[PDB]
PDB file of N, CA and C in Angstrom:
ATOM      1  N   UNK A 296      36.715  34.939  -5.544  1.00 51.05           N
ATOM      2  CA  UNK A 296      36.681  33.492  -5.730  1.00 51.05           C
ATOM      3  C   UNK A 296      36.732  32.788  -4.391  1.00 51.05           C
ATOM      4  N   UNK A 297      35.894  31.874  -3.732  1.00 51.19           N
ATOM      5  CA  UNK A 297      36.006  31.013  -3.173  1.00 51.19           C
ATOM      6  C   UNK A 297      36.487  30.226  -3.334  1.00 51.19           C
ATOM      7  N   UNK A 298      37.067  29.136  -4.116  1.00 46.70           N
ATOM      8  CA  UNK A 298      37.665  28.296  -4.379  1.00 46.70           C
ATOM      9  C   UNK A 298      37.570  27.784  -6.144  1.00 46.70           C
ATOM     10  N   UNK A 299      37.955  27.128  -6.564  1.00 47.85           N
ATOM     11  CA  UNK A 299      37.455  26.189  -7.747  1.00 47.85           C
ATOM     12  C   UNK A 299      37.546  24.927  -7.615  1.00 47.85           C
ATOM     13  N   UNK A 300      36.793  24.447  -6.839  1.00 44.76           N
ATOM     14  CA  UNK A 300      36.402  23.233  -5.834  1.00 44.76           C
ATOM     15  C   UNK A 300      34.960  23.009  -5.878  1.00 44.76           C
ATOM     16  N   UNK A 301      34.279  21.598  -6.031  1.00 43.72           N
ATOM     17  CA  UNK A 301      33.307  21.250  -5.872  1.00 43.72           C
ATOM     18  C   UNK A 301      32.522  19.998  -5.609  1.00 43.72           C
ATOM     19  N   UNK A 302      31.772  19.858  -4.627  1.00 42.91           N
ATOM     20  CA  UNK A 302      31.365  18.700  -3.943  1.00 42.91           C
ATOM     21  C   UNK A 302      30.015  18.052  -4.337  1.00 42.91           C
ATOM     22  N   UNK A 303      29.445  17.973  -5.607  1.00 42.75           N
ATOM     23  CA  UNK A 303      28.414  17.494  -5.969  1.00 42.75           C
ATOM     24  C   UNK A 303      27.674  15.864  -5.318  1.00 42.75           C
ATOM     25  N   UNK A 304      26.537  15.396  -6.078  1.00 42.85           N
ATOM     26  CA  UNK A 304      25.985  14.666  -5.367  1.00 42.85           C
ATOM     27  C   UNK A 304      25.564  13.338  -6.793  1.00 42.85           C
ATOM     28  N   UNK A 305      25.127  12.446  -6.231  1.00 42.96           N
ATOM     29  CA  UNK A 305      25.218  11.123  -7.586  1.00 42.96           C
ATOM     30  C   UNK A 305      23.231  11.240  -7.424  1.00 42.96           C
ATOM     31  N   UNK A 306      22.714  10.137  -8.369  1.00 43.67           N
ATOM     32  CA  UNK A 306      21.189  10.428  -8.634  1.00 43.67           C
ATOM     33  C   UNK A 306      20.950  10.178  -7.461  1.00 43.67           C
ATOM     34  N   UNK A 307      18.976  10.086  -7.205  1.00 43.22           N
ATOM     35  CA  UNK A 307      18.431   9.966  -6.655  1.00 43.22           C
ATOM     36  C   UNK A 307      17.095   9.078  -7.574  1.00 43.22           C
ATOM     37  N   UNK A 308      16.408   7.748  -6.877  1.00 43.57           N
ATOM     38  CA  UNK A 308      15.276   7.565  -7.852  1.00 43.57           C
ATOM     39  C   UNK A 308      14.079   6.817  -6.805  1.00 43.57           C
ATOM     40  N   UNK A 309      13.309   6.545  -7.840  1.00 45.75           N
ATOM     41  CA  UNK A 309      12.103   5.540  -6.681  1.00 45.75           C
ATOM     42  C   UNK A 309      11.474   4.778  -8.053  1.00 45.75           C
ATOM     43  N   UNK A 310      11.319   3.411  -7.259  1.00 45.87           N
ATOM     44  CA  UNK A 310      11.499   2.127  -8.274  1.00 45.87           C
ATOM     45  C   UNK A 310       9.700   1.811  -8.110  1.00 45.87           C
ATOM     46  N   UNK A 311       8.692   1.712  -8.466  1.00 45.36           N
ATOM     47  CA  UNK A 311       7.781   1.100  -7.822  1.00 45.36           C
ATOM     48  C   UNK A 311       7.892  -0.636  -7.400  1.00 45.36           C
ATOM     49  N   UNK A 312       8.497  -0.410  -6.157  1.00 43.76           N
ATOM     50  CA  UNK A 312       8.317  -2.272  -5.633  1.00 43.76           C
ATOM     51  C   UNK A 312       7.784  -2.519  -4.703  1.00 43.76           C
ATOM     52  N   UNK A 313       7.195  -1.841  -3.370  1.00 45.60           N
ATOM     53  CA  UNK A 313       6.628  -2.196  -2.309  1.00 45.60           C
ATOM     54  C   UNK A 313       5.074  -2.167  -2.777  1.00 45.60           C
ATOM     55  N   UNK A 314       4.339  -1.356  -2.511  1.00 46.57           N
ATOM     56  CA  UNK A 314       3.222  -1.610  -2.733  1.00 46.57           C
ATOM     57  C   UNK A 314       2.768  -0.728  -3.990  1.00 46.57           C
ATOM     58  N   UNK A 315       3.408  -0.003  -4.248  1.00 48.15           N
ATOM     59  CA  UNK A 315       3.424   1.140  -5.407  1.00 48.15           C
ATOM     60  C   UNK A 315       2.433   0.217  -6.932  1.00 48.15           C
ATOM     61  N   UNK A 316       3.280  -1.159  -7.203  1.00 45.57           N
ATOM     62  CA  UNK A 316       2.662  -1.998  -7.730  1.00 45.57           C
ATOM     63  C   UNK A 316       1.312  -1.881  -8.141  1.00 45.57           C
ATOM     64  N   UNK A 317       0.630  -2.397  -6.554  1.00 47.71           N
ATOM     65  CA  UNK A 317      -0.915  -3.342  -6.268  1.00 47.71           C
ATOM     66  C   UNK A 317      -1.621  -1.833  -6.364  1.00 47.71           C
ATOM     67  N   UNK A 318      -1.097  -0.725  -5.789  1.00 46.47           N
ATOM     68  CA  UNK A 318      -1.511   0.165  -6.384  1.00 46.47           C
ATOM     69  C   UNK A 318      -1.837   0.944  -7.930  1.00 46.47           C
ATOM     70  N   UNK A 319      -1.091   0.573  -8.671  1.00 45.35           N
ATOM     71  CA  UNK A 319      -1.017   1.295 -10.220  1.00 45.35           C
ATOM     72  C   UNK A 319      -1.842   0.026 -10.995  1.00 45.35           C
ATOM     73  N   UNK A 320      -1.405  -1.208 -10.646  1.00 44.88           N
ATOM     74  CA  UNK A 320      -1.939  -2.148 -11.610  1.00 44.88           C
ATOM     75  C   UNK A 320      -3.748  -2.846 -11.064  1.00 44.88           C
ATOM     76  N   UNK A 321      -4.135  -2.235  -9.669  1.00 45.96           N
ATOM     77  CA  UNK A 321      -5.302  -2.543  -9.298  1.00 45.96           C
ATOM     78  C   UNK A 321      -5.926  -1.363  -9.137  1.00 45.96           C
ATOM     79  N   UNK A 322      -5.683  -0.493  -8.150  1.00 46.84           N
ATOM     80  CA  UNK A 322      -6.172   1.389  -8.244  1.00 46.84           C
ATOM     81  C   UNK A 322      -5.107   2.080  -9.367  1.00 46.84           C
ATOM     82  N   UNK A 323      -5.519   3.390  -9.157  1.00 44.78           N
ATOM     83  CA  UNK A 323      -5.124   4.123 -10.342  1.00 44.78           C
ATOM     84  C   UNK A 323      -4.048   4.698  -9.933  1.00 44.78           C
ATOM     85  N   UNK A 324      -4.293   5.284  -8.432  1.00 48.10           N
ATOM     86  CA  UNK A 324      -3.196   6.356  -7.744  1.00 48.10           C
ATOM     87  C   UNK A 324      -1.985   6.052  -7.121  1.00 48.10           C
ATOM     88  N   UNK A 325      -0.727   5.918  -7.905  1.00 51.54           N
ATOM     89  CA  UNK A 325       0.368   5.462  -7.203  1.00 51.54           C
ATOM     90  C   UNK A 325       1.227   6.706  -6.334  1.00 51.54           C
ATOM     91  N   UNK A 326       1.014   6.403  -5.063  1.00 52.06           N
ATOM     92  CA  UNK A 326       1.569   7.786  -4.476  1.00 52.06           C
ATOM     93  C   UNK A 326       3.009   7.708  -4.524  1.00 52.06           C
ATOM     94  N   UNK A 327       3.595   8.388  -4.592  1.00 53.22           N
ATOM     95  CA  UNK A 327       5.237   8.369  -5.038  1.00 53.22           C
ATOM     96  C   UNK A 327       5.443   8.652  -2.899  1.00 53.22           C
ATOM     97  N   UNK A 328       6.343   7.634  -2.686  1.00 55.54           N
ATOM     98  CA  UNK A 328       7.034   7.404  -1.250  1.00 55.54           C
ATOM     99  C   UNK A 328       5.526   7.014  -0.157  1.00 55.54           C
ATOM    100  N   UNK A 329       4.891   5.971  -0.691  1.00 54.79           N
ATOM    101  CA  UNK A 329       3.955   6.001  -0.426  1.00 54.79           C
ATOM    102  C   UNK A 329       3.835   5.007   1.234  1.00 54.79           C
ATOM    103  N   UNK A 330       4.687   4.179   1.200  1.00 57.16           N
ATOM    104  CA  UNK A 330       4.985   3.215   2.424  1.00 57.16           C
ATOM    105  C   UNK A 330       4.989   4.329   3.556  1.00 57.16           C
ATOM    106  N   UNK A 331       6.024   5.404   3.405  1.00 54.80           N
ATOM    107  CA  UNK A 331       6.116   6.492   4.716  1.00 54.80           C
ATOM    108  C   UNK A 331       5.216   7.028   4.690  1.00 54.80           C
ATOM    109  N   UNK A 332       4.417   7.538   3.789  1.00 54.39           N
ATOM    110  CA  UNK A 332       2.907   7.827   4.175  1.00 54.39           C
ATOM    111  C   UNK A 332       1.916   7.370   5.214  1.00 54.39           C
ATOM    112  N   UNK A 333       1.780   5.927   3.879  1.00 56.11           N
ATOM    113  CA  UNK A 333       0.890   4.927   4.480  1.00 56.11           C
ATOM    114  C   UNK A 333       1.051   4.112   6.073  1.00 56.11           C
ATOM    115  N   UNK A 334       2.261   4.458   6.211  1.00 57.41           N
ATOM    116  CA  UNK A 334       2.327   4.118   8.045  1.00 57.41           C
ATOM    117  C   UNK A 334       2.209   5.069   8.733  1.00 57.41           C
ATOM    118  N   UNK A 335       2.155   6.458   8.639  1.00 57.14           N
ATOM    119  CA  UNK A 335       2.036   7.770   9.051  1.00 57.14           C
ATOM    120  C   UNK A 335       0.671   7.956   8.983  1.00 57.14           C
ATOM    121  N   UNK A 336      -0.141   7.342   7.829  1.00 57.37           N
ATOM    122  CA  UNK A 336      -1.424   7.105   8.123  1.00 57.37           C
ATOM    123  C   UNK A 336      -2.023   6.915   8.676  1.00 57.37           C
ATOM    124  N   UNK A 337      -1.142   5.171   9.264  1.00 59.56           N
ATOM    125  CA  UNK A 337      -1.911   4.241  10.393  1.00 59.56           C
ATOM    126  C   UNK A 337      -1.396   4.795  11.726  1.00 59.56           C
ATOM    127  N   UNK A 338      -0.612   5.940  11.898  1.00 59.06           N
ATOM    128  CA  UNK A 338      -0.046   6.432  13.156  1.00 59.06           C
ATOM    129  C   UNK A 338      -0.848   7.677  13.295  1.00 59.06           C
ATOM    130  N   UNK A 339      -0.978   8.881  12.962  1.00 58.31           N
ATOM    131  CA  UNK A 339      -1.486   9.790  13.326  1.00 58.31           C
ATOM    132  C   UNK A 339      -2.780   9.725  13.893  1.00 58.31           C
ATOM    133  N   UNK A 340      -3.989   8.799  13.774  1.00 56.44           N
ATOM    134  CA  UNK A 340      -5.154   8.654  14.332  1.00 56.44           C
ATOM    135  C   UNK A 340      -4.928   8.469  15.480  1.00 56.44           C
ATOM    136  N   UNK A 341      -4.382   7.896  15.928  1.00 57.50           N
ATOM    137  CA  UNK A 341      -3.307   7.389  17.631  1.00 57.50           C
ATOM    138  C   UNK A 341      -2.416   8.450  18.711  1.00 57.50           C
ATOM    139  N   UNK A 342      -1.985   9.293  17.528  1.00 55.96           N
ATOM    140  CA  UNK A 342      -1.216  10.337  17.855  1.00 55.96           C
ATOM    141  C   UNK A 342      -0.077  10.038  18.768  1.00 55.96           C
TER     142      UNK A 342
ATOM    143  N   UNK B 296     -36.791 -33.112   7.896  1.00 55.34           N
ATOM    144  CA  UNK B 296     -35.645 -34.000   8.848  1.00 55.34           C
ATOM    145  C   UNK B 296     -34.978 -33.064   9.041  1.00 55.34           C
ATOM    146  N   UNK B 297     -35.617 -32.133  10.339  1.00 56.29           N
ATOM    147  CA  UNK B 297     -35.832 -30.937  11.138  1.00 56.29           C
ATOM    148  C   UNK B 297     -34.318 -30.706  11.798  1.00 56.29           C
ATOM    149  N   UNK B 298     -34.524 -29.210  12.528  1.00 55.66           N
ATOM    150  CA  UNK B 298     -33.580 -28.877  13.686  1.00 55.66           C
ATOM    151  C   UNK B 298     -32.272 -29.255  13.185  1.00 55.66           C
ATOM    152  N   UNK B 299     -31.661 -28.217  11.912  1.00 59.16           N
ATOM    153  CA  UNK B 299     -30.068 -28.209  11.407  1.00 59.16           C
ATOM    154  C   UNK B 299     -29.329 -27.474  12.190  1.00 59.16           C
ATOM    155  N   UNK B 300     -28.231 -27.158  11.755  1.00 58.61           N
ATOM    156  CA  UNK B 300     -26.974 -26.506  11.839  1.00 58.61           C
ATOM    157  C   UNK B 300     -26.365 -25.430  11.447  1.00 58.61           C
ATOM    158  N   UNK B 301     -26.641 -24.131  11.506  1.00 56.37           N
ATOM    159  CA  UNK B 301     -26.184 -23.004  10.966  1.00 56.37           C
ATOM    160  C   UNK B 301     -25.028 -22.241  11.504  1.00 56.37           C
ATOM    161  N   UNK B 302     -24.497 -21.129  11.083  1.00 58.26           N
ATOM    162  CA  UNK B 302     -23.724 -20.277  11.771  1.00 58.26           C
ATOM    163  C   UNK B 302     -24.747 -19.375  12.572  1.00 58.26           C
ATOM    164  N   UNK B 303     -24.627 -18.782  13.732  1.00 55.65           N
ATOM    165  CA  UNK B 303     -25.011 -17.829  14.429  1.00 55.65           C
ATOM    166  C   UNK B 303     -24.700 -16.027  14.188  1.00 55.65           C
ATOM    167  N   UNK B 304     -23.161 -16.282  14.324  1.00 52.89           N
ATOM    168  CA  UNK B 304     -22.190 -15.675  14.028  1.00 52.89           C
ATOM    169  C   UNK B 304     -22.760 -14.608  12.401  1.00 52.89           C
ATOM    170  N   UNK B 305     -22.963 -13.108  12.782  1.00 53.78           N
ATOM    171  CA  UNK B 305     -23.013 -12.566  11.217  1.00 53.78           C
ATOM    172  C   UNK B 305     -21.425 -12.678  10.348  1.00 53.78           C
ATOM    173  N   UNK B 306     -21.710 -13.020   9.377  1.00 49.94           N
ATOM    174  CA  UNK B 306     -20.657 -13.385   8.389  1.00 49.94           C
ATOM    175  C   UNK B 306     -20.413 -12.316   8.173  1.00 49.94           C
ATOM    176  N   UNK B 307     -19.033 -12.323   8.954  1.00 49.05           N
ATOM    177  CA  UNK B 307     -18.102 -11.983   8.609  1.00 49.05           C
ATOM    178  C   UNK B 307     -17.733 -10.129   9.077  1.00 49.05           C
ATOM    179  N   UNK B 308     -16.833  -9.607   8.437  1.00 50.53           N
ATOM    180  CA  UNK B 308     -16.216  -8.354   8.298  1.00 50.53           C
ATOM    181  C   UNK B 308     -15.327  -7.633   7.547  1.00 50.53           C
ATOM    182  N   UNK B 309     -15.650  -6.712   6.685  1.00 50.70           N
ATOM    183  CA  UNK B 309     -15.069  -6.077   6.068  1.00 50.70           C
ATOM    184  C   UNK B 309     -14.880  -4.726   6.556  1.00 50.70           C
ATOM    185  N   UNK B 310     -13.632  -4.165   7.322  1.00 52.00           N
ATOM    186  CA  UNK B 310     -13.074  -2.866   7.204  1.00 52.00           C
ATOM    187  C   UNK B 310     -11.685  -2.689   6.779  1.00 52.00           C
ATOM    188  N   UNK B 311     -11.847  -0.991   6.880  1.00 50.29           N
ATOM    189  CA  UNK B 311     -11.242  -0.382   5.544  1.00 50.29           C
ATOM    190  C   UNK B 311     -10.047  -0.380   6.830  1.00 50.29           C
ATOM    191  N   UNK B 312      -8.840  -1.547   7.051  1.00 48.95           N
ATOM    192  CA  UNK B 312      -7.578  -1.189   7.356  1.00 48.95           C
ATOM    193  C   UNK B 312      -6.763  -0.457   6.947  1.00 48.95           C
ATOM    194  N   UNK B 313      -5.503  -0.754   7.247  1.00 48.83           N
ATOM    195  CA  UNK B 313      -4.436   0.066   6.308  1.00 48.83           C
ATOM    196  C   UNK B 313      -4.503  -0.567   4.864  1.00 48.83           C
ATOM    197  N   UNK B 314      -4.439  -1.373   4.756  1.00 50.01           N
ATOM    198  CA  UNK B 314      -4.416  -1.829   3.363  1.00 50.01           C
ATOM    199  C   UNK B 314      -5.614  -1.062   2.308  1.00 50.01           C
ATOM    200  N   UNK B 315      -6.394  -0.925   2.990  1.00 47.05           N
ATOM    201  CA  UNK B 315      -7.472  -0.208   2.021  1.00 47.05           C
ATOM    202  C   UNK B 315      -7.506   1.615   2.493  1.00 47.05           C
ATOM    203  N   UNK B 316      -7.753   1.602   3.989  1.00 46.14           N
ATOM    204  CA  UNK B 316      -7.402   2.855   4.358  1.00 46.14           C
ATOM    205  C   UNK B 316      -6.560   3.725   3.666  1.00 46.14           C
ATOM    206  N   UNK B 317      -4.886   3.201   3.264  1.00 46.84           N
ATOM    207  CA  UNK B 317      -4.181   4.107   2.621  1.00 46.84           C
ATOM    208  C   UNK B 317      -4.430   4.390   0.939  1.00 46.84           C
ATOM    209  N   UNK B 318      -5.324   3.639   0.537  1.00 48.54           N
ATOM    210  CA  UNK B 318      -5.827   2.988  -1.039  1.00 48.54           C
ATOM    211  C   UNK B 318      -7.129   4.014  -0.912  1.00 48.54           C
ATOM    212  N   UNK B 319      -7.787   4.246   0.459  1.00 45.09           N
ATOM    213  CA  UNK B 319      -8.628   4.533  -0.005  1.00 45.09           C
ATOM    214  C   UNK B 319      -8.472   6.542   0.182  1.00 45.09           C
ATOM    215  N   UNK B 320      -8.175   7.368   0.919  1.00 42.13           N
ATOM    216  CA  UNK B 320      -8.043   8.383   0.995  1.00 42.13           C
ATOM    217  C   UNK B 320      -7.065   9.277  -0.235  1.00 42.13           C
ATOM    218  N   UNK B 321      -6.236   8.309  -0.342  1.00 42.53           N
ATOM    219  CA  UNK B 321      -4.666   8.593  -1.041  1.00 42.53           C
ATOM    220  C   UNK B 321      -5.776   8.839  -2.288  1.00 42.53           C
ATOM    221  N   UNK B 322      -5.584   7.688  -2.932  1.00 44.08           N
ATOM    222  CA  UNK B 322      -6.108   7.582  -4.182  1.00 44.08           C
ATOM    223  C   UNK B 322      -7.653   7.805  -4.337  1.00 44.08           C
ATOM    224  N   UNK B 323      -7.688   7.120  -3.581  1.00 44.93           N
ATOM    225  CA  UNK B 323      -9.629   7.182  -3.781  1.00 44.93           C
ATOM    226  C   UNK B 323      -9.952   5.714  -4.528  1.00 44.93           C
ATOM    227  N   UNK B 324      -8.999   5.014  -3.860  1.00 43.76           N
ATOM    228  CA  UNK B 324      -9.245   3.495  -5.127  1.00 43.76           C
ATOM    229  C   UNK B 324      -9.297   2.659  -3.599  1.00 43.76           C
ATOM    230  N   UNK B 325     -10.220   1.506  -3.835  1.00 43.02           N
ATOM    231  CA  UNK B 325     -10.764   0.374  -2.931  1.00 43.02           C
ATOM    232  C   UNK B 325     -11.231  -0.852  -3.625  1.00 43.02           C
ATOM    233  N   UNK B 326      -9.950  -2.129  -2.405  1.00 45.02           N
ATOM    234  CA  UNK B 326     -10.044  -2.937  -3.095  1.00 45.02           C
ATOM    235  C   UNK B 326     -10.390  -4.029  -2.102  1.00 45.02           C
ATOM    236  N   UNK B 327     -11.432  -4.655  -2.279  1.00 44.37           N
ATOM    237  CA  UNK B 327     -11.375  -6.056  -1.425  1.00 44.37           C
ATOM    238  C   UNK B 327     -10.995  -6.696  -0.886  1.00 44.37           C
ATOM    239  N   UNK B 328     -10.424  -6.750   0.226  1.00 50.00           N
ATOM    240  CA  UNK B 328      -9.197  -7.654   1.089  1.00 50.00           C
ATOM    241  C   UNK B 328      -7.834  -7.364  -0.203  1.00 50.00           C
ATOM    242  N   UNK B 329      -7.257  -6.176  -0.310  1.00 50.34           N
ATOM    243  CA  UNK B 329      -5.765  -6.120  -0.657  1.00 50.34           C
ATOM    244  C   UNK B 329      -4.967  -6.675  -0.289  1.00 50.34           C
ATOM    245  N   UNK B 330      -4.994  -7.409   1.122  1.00 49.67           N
ATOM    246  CA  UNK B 330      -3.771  -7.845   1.877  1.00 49.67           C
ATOM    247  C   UNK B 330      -3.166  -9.012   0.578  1.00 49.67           C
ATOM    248  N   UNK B 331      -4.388  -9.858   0.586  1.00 51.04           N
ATOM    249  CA  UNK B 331      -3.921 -11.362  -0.279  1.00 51.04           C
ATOM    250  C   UNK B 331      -3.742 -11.136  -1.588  1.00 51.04           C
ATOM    251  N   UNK B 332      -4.621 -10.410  -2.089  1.00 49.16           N
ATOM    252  CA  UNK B 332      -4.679 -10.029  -3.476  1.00 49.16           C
ATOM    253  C   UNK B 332      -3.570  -9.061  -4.077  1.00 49.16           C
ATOM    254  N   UNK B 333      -2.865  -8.256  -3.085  1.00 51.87           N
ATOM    255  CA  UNK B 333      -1.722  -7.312  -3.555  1.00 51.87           C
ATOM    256  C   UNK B 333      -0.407  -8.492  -2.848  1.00 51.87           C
ATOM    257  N   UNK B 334      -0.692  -9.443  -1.955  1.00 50.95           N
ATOM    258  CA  UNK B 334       0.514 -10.456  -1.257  1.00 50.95           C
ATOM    259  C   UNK B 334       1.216 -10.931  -2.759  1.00 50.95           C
ATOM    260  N   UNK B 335      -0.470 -11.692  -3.519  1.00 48.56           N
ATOM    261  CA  UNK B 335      -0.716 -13.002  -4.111  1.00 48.56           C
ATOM    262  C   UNK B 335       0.170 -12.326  -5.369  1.00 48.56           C
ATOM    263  N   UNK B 336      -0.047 -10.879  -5.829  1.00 48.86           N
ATOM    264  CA  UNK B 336      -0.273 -10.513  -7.330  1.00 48.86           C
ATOM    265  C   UNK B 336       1.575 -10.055  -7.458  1.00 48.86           C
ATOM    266  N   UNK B 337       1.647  -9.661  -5.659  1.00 48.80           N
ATOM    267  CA  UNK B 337       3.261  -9.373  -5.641  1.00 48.80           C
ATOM    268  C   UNK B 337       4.364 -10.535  -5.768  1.00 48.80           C
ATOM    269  N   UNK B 338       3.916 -11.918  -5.373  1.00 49.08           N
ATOM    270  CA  UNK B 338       4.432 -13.253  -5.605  1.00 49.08           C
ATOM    271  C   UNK B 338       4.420 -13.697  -6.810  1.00 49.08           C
ATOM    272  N   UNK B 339       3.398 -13.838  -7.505  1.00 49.07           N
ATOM    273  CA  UNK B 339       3.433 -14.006  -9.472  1.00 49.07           C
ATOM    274  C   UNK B 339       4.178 -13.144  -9.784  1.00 49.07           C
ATOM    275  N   UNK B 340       4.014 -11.685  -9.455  1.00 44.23           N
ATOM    276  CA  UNK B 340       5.000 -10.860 -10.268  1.00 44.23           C
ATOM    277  C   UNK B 340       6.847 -11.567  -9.664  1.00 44.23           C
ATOM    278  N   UNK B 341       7.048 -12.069  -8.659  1.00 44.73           N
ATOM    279  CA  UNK B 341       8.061 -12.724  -9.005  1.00 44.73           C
ATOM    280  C   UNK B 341       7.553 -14.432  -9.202  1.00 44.73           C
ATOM    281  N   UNK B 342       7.097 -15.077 -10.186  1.00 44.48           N
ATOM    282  CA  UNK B 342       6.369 -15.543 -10.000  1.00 44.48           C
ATOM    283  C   UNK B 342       5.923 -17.126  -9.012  1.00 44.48           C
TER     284      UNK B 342
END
Protein backbone atom coordinates (compact mmCIF):
# COMPACT_ATOMS: atom_id res chain seq x y z
CA UNK A 1 0.00 0.00 0.00
CA UNK A 2 1.09 3.37 -0.75
CA UNK A 3 -1.15 5.24 1.01
CA UNK A 4 -5.11 5.56 1.00
CA UNK A 5 -4.83 9.05 -0.09
CA UNK A 6 -5.94 10.78 -3.15
CA UNK A 7 -5.50 13.92 -5.13
CA UNK A 8 -8.00 14.03 -7.96
CA UNK A 9 -8.89 16.81 -10.37
CA UNK A 10 -12.53 18.92 -10.96
CA UNK A 11 -13.98 19.03 -14.93
CA UNK A 12 -12.58 20.34 -17.77
CA UNK A 13 -14.90 21.90 -20.82
CA UNK A 14 -14.96 24.21 -24.01
CA UNK A 15 -17.97 26.50 -24.47
CA UNK A 16 -18.23 27.60 -28.19
CA UNK A 17 -17.82 31.61 -27.70
CA UNK A 18 -14.92 33.06 -29.55
CA UNK A 19 -15.20 32.32 -32.94
CA UNK A 20 -16.29 28.65 -32.66
CA UNK A 21 -19.83 30.36 -33.25
CA UNK A 22 -19.34 32.20 -36.87
CA UNK A 23 -17.85 29.04 -37.52
CA UNK A 24 -20.71 26.27 -36.87
CA UNK A 25 -23.57 28.68 -37.66
CA UNK A 26 -21.88 30.07 -41.12
CA UNK A 27 -19.17 27.06 -42.11
CA UNK A 28 -19.72 23.68 -41.01
CA UNK A 29 -16.29 22.90 -39.25
CA UNK A 30 -16.05 23.97 -35.70
CA UNK A 31 -12.50 23.17 -34.67
CA UNK A 32 -12.54 22.42 -30.99
CA UNK A 33 -9.54 25.03 -29.36
CA UNK A 34 -9.61 26.64 -32.45
CA UNK A 35 -8.32 30.43 -31.51
CA UNK A 36 -4.72 28.59 -30.54
CA UNK A 37 -4.75 27.13 -33.75
CA UNK A 38 -5.91 29.83 -35.72
CA UNK A 39 -3.05 32.20 -34.44
CA UNK A 40 -0.50 29.43 -34.85
CA UNK A 41 -1.80 29.57 -38.25
CA UNK A 42 -1.13 33.15 -38.79
CA UNK A 43 2.42 32.49 -37.10
CA UNK A 44 4.05 29.58 -38.60
CA UNK A 45 4.23 31.03 -42.29
CA UNK A 46 6.66 33.69 -40.58
CA UNK A 47 8.32 31.19 -38.56
CA UNK B 1 -21.81 66.16 -71.73
CA UNK B 2 -18.38 64.50 -72.08
CA UNK B 3 -15.06 63.86 -69.99
CA UNK B 4 -16.60 62.24 -66.38
CA UNK B 5 -15.28 60.95 -63.34
CA UNK B 6 -14.40 57.44 -62.58
CA UNK B 7 -12.30 55.41 -60.21
CA UNK B 8 -8.88 54.45 -61.66
CA UNK B 9 -8.11 52.37 -58.86
CA UNK B 10 -9.20 48.31 -59.61
CA UNK B 11 -11.97 47.75 -57.10
CA UNK B 12 -11.00 46.62 -54.59
CA UNK B 13 -9.51 43.27 -52.75
CA UNK B 14 -10.38 40.23 -51.54
CA UNK B 15 -7.79 37.92 -49.66
CA UNK B 16 -8.03 34.96 -47.80
CA UNK B 17 -6.61 36.53 -44.21
CA UNK B 18 -6.80 34.96 -41.04
CA UNK B 19 -10.28 35.28 -40.85
CA UNK B 20 -10.88 33.20 -43.87
CA UNK B 21 -7.39 31.56 -43.96
CA UNK B 22 -8.19 29.67 -40.69
CA UNK B 23 -12.03 28.97 -42.14
CA UNK B 24 -10.55 28.06 -45.01
CA UNK B 25 -7.86 25.10 -44.54
CA UNK B 26 -9.40 24.00 -41.07
CA UNK B 27 -12.72 23.44 -42.35
CA UNK B 28 -12.72 23.96 -45.88
CA UNK B 29 -15.60 26.61 -45.36
CA UNK B 30 -15.16 30.38 -46.93
CA UNK B 31 -16.80 33.25 -46.14
CA UNK B 32 -16.82 36.78 -47.50
CA UNK B 33 -15.22 39.37 -45.41
CA UNK B 34 -15.89 37.23 -41.93
CA UNK B 35 -14.34 39.94 -40.03
CA UNK B 36 -17.88 42.06 -40.01
CA UNK B 37 -20.13 39.40 -40.64
CA UNK B 38 -18.80 36.97 -37.73
CA UNK B 39 -18.10 40.84 -35.55
CA UNK B 40 -21.87 41.77 -36.60
CA UNK B 41 -23.55 38.08 -36.05
CA UNK B 42 -21.35 37.87 -32.62
CA UNK B 43 -23.05 41.34 -31.39
CA UNK B 44 -26.87 40.22 -32.19
CA UNK B 45 -26.05 37.07 -30.64
CA UNK B 46 -25.64 39.32 -27.61
CA UNK B 47 -27.90 41.36 -29.20
Amino acid sequence: EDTEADVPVTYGEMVLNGANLVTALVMGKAVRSLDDVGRHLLDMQEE
